[PDB]
Every structure is written in structure tokens, then in C-alpha cells.
């Protein structure tokens, strides 16, 4: 993958993890 | 695409040049050979007439044709029709424009383009925006092939160019200004006044376009076309 | 500059500050030049010009306010008009 | 009841020995004790009331009269002004851009106050609590609080009624509708969010 696309993928995945985080904490 | 149009008329013969009459144009007395040309116009009817539809018109011609000589070919004079006299439309000075061939010819690289403009009102209340151009030149015995300026001589010559144009326009009429641009005496005045700052070359005035027209004054027109 | 000239006068010559003191100096004729800020009341300025014309003195206008005039003089407070009792070691009287 | 401060300018009666007091809407930069020169041959100064027929183009004016002898028609709200666009010498008429953005053509003998109406930027702070809105509307009229028609009974409002809270019919109401059916958007040419230029 390109660096931009890999970083975008992990950023979206981080957004999803933080959205899941906000439900419990 | 003669056979590709599908919808030609969404709503659902006589040749139009039989109702058109030739009209011969004339030019100010500033230009020697008046002899402008001829133009079409719809025949004079009771609804719109021909004078009203021909009253507003600006015809563009070349100064070389007007003056007969050939050293004015790069300058084209724009004449505006404003009044008729029974099959001879009469014009007046409307502007001057340097042809694209000449303007892009003097514009070369490895030289400095000096430009300026002035908004000045004449004696006859003709608010005019006059443009001027100037290019730096390689003086004789010079070996450096750039011939650039230091941006301070440019401002100085720009100030001198502006005041020269202001002086020769404020204190004269439109007819006098037209009779002044043709001999190109303004270029001589500039090259006399800005020769102590930088040599320069191709001193010219670009456009004398009109901005505001005063009261119609059909009296001045009759003096123009004697 | 005018600010440097005023500072030199304040340092060397005799100066007085305020409006009543300026009027007193004009009355006694011990004044030569008066500098009035562009922020003083127009009535006060006009009366100052009347006194100056009666006493045959010079009038100068400071293109600022009372704060700027006080800063140029060298004081923290607000000065509306300064009367120059003695030039001292400066030249503000002879020039400008 | 008005967000624009008022200025009490008093004049001298030219025909009788008596002081006339006039109420003018205060403009930005106008202070007490200021001399206001109202008339035709005045100067282009803030607060002056020169007619629009003797001012240069691009002039910012206020309290513009629709017709001569109106004593204030347009630009009477805080922070609003009228822009002069041009003048016609023959058949004297001045062209004006109004605060709404609608082109207008008025007579050249319409007097207007030079400047910008004071109190500009008044609607830039949320009323925050209902008390501020109540106090603001009490000094104006009985138009607060306002009850939604969709929460009403079918007899008290056309949009009311039903087991749910829905309009039922289209909110857009034609211009040629009699009194009673005009509850919603009146002659709405377009609806929805205004995205892009308004093509004014």
C-alpha cells in the first residue's frame, strides 16, 4: 500500500476504536 | 452534422437583404481621406426606422487607410457613429488601439517593460484613460545582454510619462488630441524628457479609449465634418 | 525632530505645564512659544490663540493628543498645552 | 422597542422665533453637541442629510426616503445602509442598492443621512436564556412565545391533528390562497437548504 492510504486506513480504524471507546468510558 | 439534429423546432423565406440599404460612412476632418466605407441597415420603417438602429454604432478602421500613408498601419482608429444626414452616417473619435501584431512584437525578453496610464479630462469634457508603453534598450558599446532597470528609474520615468501625458491632454480638446496623436509628437516629448534617466526604446501610447461622453452637441459635429 | 526639540527644551530651558499656567505666562508676557495639542477643546484653543495674538507670541500645533504631548515633553500625565518660558540650549524658538 | 439609538437634533425655525426639536436616528460617529447641516448645499460629512441627487457615486447613506417629502423610508435599522450606484441627468433618478440587495430607482430629491446607523452588529450574541427574549419582545409586541401549529388540534391549526406530529399536506402555500390556508411557506419558489449563490 501507499503511505497515504495505509495512514488513512489506520486513522479510520483509530476513529472506529475511539468511537467504541466512547461507549464504555 | 447535417443529419444528426433530432429536435429542430421545439415549439411545433424571402431573402433578408432586399430590405437592407447601403449607407456610406464618413470620418472626422482630422483624418485626410475620409472615405470610410459602407454598411448595411434595415430599411426605414414606421416602427423602428433606420436612423434609430444606426445611431449607435462603433466602426473600427486602420489609421494607415485614413491617413493614406503606411507608417500608421499598427494603429487602428475606432470611430463611433452618432448621427446621420440622409445616407451618409457621420462618426467621431472613440478610441485608439495598438494592433496585436505590433504589441507582441516590441514585447521581447531580456528587457524591461515600462507602462503607465492616466485618467484625464479634456477641454470638451471627454474623460479619457490614456495608456503608454516603453521598453529599455541596449545602448551602443554595451556588452551585457540584459539591459534591465533598477525599479527606481522605472518609477521616475513612470512619473515623467504620467505628467507629460497630463500636460499635453489637459489644455486641449478631443479634436486637438486626435490631431496630436497622429504626428506621434507625444512620443518625441517623452523621449526628450526621459532620456536623462534611462535610454529606453519603442516609446508609444497604447490606448486612448473613451470613458465618459459629454452633451451631444450636434454643433461640434458639423464643424468636424466640413 | 519636533519631539527631540521639545525634549531638549524640557532638559535645558525653563518650561511650564498646564493650561492655567500657560494663561498666566501669556498674561505676564514671559512666554515666547506655546504648543497646543490637537486634542484640546476648541474653545480653550481659541482663547489660547486670542491670548497669544494679544501678547505677540508664537503658536504651534502638536499633531497628536494630550497623551502624545505629555510623552513628547517627558511626563507620564496628560499635557494639553505647553508654554516655553525660555529656549535654553535648544533652537525651537528660532527654527520651525 | 428599537435597537438603534436616537439622537435629538434641534434646529431654528426660519419663519418664527422658536426652537424646533427633531428626532433623528443616530448614526455611527455622531456625538452630542455636533452641528448637523441638513439641506442641499451642505458638505459630504457624516450625519448630514444631503439629497441623493447631489452626491458622488458609491455614497453610503441612511434614512433614505422612497419619495420626496417622506421623512425617512429606507435604511432605518441598526447597522444598515444604502449604496449609491448611479444617477441619471435627464429625468433625474438615483439608483440605490438596498440592505436587502434589491435594486431600486428613486427620485433625485430624496434626502438621506450620510453614515451608518448606530447599533450595528446587534444580532451577533445569542439571547442565551428565555428571559432576554421575553424582555426584548415585551417592549415590541405580543408575539412571544410562539406555539407550533403541528402540535395543535386540527381546529386550531391546519397543520395540527393526527396521532403523530406531521404537517400532512405540503407546507408551501400558493399566493392566491384565501385567509386561513396561508399557514407555512407563502409562494415559496424554492425550498430546502440554500446551497450556493442566491442568483440575486
Amino acid at each position: 500500500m501507499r503511505a497515504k492510504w495505509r495512514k488513512k486506513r489506520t486513522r479510520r480504524l483509530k476513529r472506529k476504536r475511539r468511537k467504541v471507546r466512547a461507549r464504555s468510558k | 452534422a447535417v443529419g444528426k439534429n433530432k429536435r429542430l423546432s421545439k415549439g411545433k423565406v424571402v431573402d433578408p437583404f432586399t430590405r437592407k440599404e447601403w449607407f456610406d460612412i464618413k470620418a472626422p476632418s482630422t483624418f485626410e481621406n475620409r472615405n470610410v466605407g459602407k454598411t448595411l441597415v434595415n430599411k426605414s420603417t414606421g416602427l423602428k426606422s433606420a436612423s434609430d438602429a444606426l445611431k449607435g454604432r462603433v466602426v473600427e478602421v486602420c489609421l494607415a487607410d485614413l491617413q493614406g500613408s503606411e507608417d500608421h498601419s499598427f494603429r487602428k482608429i475606432k470611430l463611433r457613429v452618432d448621427e446621420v444626414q440622409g445616407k451618409n452616417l457621420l462618426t467621431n473619435f472613440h478610441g485608439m488601439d495598438f494592433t496585436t501584431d505590433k504589441l507582441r512584437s516590441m514585447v521581447r525578453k531580456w528587457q524591461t517593460l515600462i507602462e503607465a496610464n492616466v485618467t484625464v479630462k479634456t477641454s470638451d469634457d471627454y474623460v479619457l484613460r490614456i495608456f503608454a508603453i516603453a521598453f529599455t534598450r541596449k545602448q551602443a558599446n554595451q556588452v551585457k545582454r540584459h539591459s534591465y532597470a533598477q525599479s527606481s528609474h522605472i518609477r521616475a520615468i513612470r512619473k515623467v510619462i504620467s505628467e507629460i501625458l497630463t500636460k499635453e491632454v489637459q489644455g486641449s480638446t478631443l479634436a486637438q488630441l486626435t490631431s496630436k496623436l497622429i504626428p506621434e509628437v507625444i512620443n518625441k516629448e517623452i523621449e526628450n524628457a526621459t532620456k536623462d534617466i534611462f535610454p529606453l526604446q519603442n516609446i508609444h501610447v497604447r490606448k486612448v479609449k473613451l470613458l465618459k461622453q459629454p452633451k451631444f452637441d450636434v454643433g461640434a459635429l458639423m464643424a468636424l465634418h466640413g | 525632530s519636533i519631539n527631540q526639540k521639545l525634549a531638549l527644551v524640557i532638559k535645558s530651558g525653563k518650561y511650564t505645564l498646564g493650561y492655567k499656567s500657560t494663561v498666566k505666562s501669556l498674561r505676564q508676557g514671559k512666554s515666547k512659544l506655546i504648543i497646543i495639542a490637537a486634542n484640546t477643546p476648541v474653545l480653550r484653543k481659541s482663547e489660547l490663540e486670542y491670548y497669544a495674538m494679544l501678547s505677540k507670541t508664537k503658536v504651534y500645533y502638536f499633531q497628536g493628543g494630550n497623551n502624545e504631548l505629555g510623552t513628547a515633553v517627558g511626563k507620564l500625565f496628560r499635557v494639553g498645552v505647553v508654554s516655553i518660558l525660555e529656549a535654553g540650549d535648544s533652537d525651537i524658538l528660532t527654527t520651525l | 422597542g428599537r435597537g438603534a439609538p436616537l439622537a435629538k437634533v434641534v434646529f431654528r425655525d426660519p419663519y418664527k422665533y422658536r426652537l424646533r426639536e427633531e428626532i433623528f436616528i443616530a448614526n455611527e460617529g455622531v456625538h452630542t453637541g455636533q452641528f448637523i447641516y441638513a439641506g442641499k448645499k451642505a458638505s459630504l460629512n457624516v450625519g448630514n442629510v444631503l439629497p441623493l441627487g447631489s452626491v458622488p457615486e458609491g455614497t453610503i447613506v441612511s434614512n433614505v426616503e422612497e419619495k420626496p417629502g417622506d421623512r425617512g423610508a429606507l435604511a432605518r435599522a441598526s447597522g444598515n445602509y444604502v449604496i449609491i450606484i448611479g444617477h441619471n441627468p435627464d429625468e433625474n433618478k438615483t439608483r440605490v442598492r438596498l440592505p436587502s440587495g434589491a435594486k431600486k430607482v428613486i427620485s433625485s430629491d430624496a434626502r438621506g443621512v450620510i453614515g451608518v446607523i448606530a447599533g450595528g452588529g446587534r444580532v451577533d450574541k445569542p439571547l442565551l436564556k428565555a428571559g432576554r427574549a421575553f424582555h426584548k419582545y415585551r417592549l415590541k409586541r405580543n408575539s412571544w412565545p410562539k406555539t407550533r401549529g403541528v402540535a395543535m388540534n386540527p381546529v386550531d391549526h391546519p397543520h395540527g391533528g393526527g396521532n403523530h406530529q406531521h404537517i400532512g399536506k405540503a407546507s408551501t402555500i400558493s399566493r392566491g390562497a384565501v385567509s386561513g390556508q396561508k399557514a407555512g411557506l407563502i409562494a415559496a419558489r424554492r425550498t430546502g437548504l440554500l446551497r450556493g449563490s442566491q442568483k440575486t
Binding site: - | - | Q4, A7, L8, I10, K11, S12, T71, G74, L76, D89, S90 | -
Partner: protein, 150 residues
């Protein structure tokens, strides 16, 4: 060099080797000393006194003509300014940018220059306080800076 810029140009004065000079000078030491204080009495800073005495009089430098320097002579005869001249002009320049930045706030270039000037003033003030020229508690106050320049 150029403490607060990227320049590296070298340009200064090259004094002559002759510590006893300029030979052709004929005026006395006392004559130039009373000229120094006369110029100092009319508000001229030591730099301008040397400049005026160098181009108008025959005084090449006031160190070989006299026994001391211009600032040294001013202090001895009682015409020494309270604050150093170089610091005085630096503070004068600083309040000029602050005056410029109080009306045209959107000038970020002036803000960067103002920080550079203020940093330069503080560095110079530290040396003067250390060398026991200014009061030990002397500080550069922005509000009081305009009053300090008088």
C-alpha cells in the same frame, strides 16, 4: 556575525596605526574638549559629536587628540546621559514598532521584528546591569518604555 539576521557582511572603520596623529593638526587639546561639551550641551549623542567633529573639524578621532574618549569626557564634565546611548536608541526603535503594531495588528513581520528588538534590548540590559551602569533592578517595561525615551 549579524546576531539577529543571516547576513555575514564585513564593514567597519580601519583606524590608522599612528596613535599620535594627524600631525598636521594644530588646535590645542583644551580647544577640542570645550567643543565636545558644547556639542554635548545641545543634546548631541557621543556618536554625533564624533561624526560632526570628524567631517567639520580636523579631529580624526577624539582619542588621540584628547587624553580620553568622548563618552569619558562627557561623564567627567557632567554631561553623561542616565541610560546608555545604544540602549536608548534600541528602546526608541522598540516603541516605534509597538506604535506601528497598535494600529496595523495584522503585521506579523513587525511582530517578529519586535520580538527580535526586545530580545536584543534584554541582552544588552543584562550586560549593563552586570557592568554596574544601570540600576540592578532595571527592567524593560513596555508601558514605561515610551516614557524612558522621553
Amino acid at each position: 556575525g549579524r546576531m539577529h539576521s543571516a547576513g555575514k557582511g564585513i564593514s567597519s572603520s580601519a583606524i590608522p596605526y599612528s596613535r599620535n596623529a594627524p600631525a598636521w593638526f594644530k588646535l590645542s587639546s583644551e580647544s577640542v574638549i570645550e567643543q565636545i561639551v558644547k556639542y554635548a550641551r545641545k543634546g548631541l549623542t557621543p556618536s554625533q559629536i564624533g561624526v560632526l567633529l570628524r567631517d567639520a573639524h580636523g579631529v580624526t578621532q577624539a582619542r588621540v587628540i584628547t587624553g580620553n574618549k568622548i563618552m569619558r569626557i562627557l561623564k567627567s564634565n557632567g554631561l553623561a546621559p542616565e541610560i546608555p546611548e545604544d540602549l536608548y536608541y534600541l528602546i526608541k526603535k522598540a516603541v516605534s514598532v509597538r506604535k506601528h503594531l497598535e494600529r496595523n495588528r495584522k503585521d506579523k513581520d513587525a511582530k517578529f521584528r519586535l520580538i527580535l528588538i526586545e530580545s536584543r534590548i534584554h541582552r544588552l540590559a543584562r550586560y549593563y546591569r552586570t557592568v554596574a551602569v544601570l540600576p540592578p533592578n532595571w527592567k524593560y517595561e513596555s508601558a514605561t518604555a515610551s516614557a524612558l525615551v522621553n
